[PDB]
Design a protein around this ligand. Structure first.
Ligand code: HEM
Ligand code: HEM
Ligand SMILES: CNCc1cccc(OCc2ccc3ccc(N)nc3c2)c1
Ligand SMILES: CNCc1cccc(OCc2ccc3ccc(N)nc3c2)c1
Ligand SMILES: C[C@H](O)[C@H](O)[C@H]1CNc2nc(N)[nH]c(=O)c2N1
Ligand SMILES: C[C@H](O)[C@H](O)[C@H]1CNc2nc(N)[nH]c(=O)c2N1
Ligand SMILES: [Zn+2]
Lengths: 411, 407
């Protein structure tokens, strides 16, 4: 069964055959669409077919489907599963898996880069200190003095779910958030809960507006431990505006390396609960969401005052105006410091090309319109006018519950 | 089976039971979501009638009453007899208001109950239709103090006697393809502008020519009619800081009056039911003016502002897009023509959502359409989880008449 998507700006029609290889559920039914819903210990019983499907995929990709190497590998995995209840991926399979998980991430606009991913195998890691070391190396390699390089570090896979490796931080580098007695928030409100945990775990908080959070690291199902990323490894960028000289006085900065660390990587049925990965920022992530979301730094007001906009009526579009200047400032600051960033026009334009290439070479490209379209200026980017089809392929990146809600404390 | 939606800005969680009433299909499946896809007999009829009458009589607190049962009996008999049936005025008004109430893509639904319904089911000719439409336009315009309205033409019989308004809106600008390769006026209307000419229209070949009406009564061939200019309220577009803006020669009409949809009530089909409300600023400034496949004026506006259009990263398009949208709102408000900005409208919709969750058990909503085409995440709807599902009465898309007309 074939499915067509239409770009309403170009009338380019594309045909999806890849959605047929999809197994996992969407949340949607014939009677309801959950397209805008944010989020809608395993036995041998289901493991081998999941392993087999992955290995069929891998061996097709390397043009060896049906080969003796293919068959022997299938046999070998089967035996290891029934003997040990799990299996180990080869390095080749791991690398292939991680890249394909990124390729399959329907909410990621940056996927044109998917084949250039540096995979760090951390499956020999055993302790939190070991995790700290690997992560430091990840940060140094990925940052590369501002010339950012996509990377992922993969810690050991889940066994019984009682020995999980987890990075408790949602991103490797994030700023602290502190709730004040007067109800106000100092720093990043998104991080208040996590900041509190760190403080409780013994972190001495400087209590500033931009304190880089410590790493909270869990190895082998043990209680997490605190570590401080060496500051010389944390690249930051002062935010100024090219024409507005007062903008620097807002005292804003951001870190250069977006490195998501709370997701779960699924490959051939194996679960990698600690797999921190990094790319580089699209400007709007910082300039629209991180600064201008009301539940975040929320600086639209102060920026608007300083611009002397008519803030009396919303129909002056003072919010829109201030939002653009902040986003201009973010891009300017990063470019000026030679730190890799991409604007939402460039990234969406690249995504469309990538998407079309994926349709031709792969039979489709699953894409979540709700997340692909940038959070400002939607319809003046070409993704807005692009019909997309959303469905789930493995290998994949999945959400997982926050470890503090599930963890069994050792003491 | 009882579904929750969360607002991630406020943590407010609403619970949806209304979705369980849904009948029609979304296009999505368990394996694939089609949320961003633009277009996904007597025995059929009586359950459809029943369902509607059931909800109508429940709405007036007379569910399971003599009046209810009688009407059910009467309609059942009339279906058995006539192979169709007619709505009571009360049912017609209720049905139309609820079609709007159910329009999951409409951000303006907080106004749903205040719809003026014009029953035009006595209409027999295109001239008649023209008269009715002129009355609608005049009433809804109200000298700039716009009032929502719908005019309902006779329901489908055997699909050979269809009433249709061939225009997609009662008021739209013509589009012409030049030999020069470009396009003058509105590119979206190039084909319809052609069919007007093919049918006998005399285009002024301008840039903002109000298109004539193309009216089809009783399945007959469509006829042309020129809306009295005095009934077409237009707004010259000027910027409250940039005096050069007026030299762009831009204007827009005050009355958005969608005329190409199909109204379904109780299984009955109204192929001709033009309706109108008032504009959200972005509809004109973002989509109509700055869409590449539309007036596409971003380039020229940017130049006039002397922005560094060398690199996308200067965000010059974004800057121009804002000012353009400032100007649209400024012009309408100055001329006292009703308009709403995307902030006010989205805020209103959140309140309406909460009202509906509170008083109806939910509110079908298509995030992809509700979130405005600029400044998305600084409007409250962006952070609002929504559930999309189809309820009846409803407005539906329908094929363009020319692709279908048995001439
Ligand atoms: C290299 C430059 C990259 C750019 C510019 C980019 C861009 C983005 C953006 C803007 C989002 C939406 C984030 C949000 O609004 O919350 C996103 C989501 C996502 N990205 Fe990428 N990305 C890049 C690299 C990567 C890499 C290297 C990976 C993994 C190896 C990845 C995997 C994902 C996943 C799984 C999501 C969905 C997150 C979720 O479900 O909440 N991306 N990306
Ligand atoms: C009174 C003020 C109103 C406002 C501000 C408003 C706003 C909007 C907007 C912005 C859209 C998106 C349209 C687009 O991007 O093309 C829309 C769609 C829609 N509106 Fe409303 N509207 C109003 C009144 C009405 C009325 C009176 C009706 C019917 C009686 C209606 C029915 C619909 C329907 C069916 C759609 C979806 C059409 C489609 O699927 O393309 N609206 N509305
Ligand atoms: C539930 N949504 C919030 C949430 C929770 C957990 C991870 C996450 O990731 C967003 C994300 C993921 C990967 C990215 C890679 C690069 C980049 N510039 N941004 C990126 C942003 C987002
Ligand atoms: C599918 N998009 C094109 C298309 C086809 C058919 C109807 C339609 O109408 C959109 C629409 C409908 C009703 C509206 C009422 C008020 C308003 N300001 N805009 C409105 C916009 C739009
Ligand atoms: C409710 C809604 O689904 C939610 O706010 C989503 C919308 N689209 C998004 N898109 C991106 N890229 N990132 C996000 O966090 C969100 N949030
Ligand atoms: C491809 C995509 O579905 C298309 O551009 C949609 C997206 N959202 C929209 N939203 C509104 N309000 N109006 C539209 O015409 C569209 N078009
Ligand atoms: Zn869906």
């Amino acid at each position: 069964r074939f499915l067509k998507v239409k770009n309403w700006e170009t009338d380019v029609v594309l045909t999806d055959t890849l959605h047929l290889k999809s197994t996992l559920e969407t949340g949607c039914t014939e009677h309801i669409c959950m397209g805008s819903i944010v989020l809608p210990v395993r036995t041998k019983d289901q493991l081998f077919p999941l392993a087999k499907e992955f290995l069929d995929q891998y061996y097709s990709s390397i043009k060896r489907f049906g080969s003796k190497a293919h068959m022997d590998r299938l046999e070998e995995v089967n035996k290891e599963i029934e003997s040990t209840s799990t299996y180990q991926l080869k390095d080749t399979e791991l690398i292939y898996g991680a890249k394909h998980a990124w390729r399959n991430a329907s909410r990621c606009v940056g996927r044109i880069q998917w084949s250039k991913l540096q995979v760090f195998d951390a499956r020999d890691c055993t302790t939190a200190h070991g995790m700290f070391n690997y992560i430091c190396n990840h940060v140094k390699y990925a940052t590369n003095k501002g010339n950012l390089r996509s990377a992922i570090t993969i810690f050991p896979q889940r066994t019984d779910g009682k020995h999980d490796f987890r990075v408790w931080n949602s991103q490797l580098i994030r700023y602290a958030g502190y709730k004040q007695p007067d109800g106000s928030t100092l720093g990043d409100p998104a991080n208040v809960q996590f900041t509190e945990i760190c403080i409780q775990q013994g972190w001495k908080a400087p209590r500033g507006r931009f304190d880089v959070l410590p790493l909270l690291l869990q190895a082998n199902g043990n209680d997490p431990e605190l570590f401080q990323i060496p500051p010389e490894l944390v690249l930051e960028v002062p935010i100024r505006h090219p024409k507005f000289d007062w903008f620097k006085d807002l005292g804003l900065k951001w870190y250069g390396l977006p490195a998501v660390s709370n997701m779960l990587l699924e490959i051939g049925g194996l679960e990698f609960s600690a797999c921190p990965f990094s790319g580089w920022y699209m400007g709007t992530e910082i300039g629209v969401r991180n600064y201008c979301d009301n539940s975040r730094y929320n600086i639209l007001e102060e920026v608007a005052k300083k611009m002397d906009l008519d803030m009396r009526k919303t129909s002056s579009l003072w919010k829109d105006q201030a939002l653009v200047e902040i986003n201009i400032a973010v891009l300017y600051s990063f470019q000026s410091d030679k730190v890799t960033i991409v604007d939402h026009h460039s990234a969406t334009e690249s995504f469309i090309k990538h998407m079309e290439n994926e349709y031709r070479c792969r039979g489709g490209c699953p894409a979540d319109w709700v997340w692909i379209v940038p959070p400002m200026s939607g319809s003046i980017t070409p993704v807005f006018h692009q019909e997309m089809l959303n469905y789930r392929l493995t290998p994949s990146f999945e959400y997982q519950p926050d470890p503090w809600n599930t963890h069994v404390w050792k003491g």
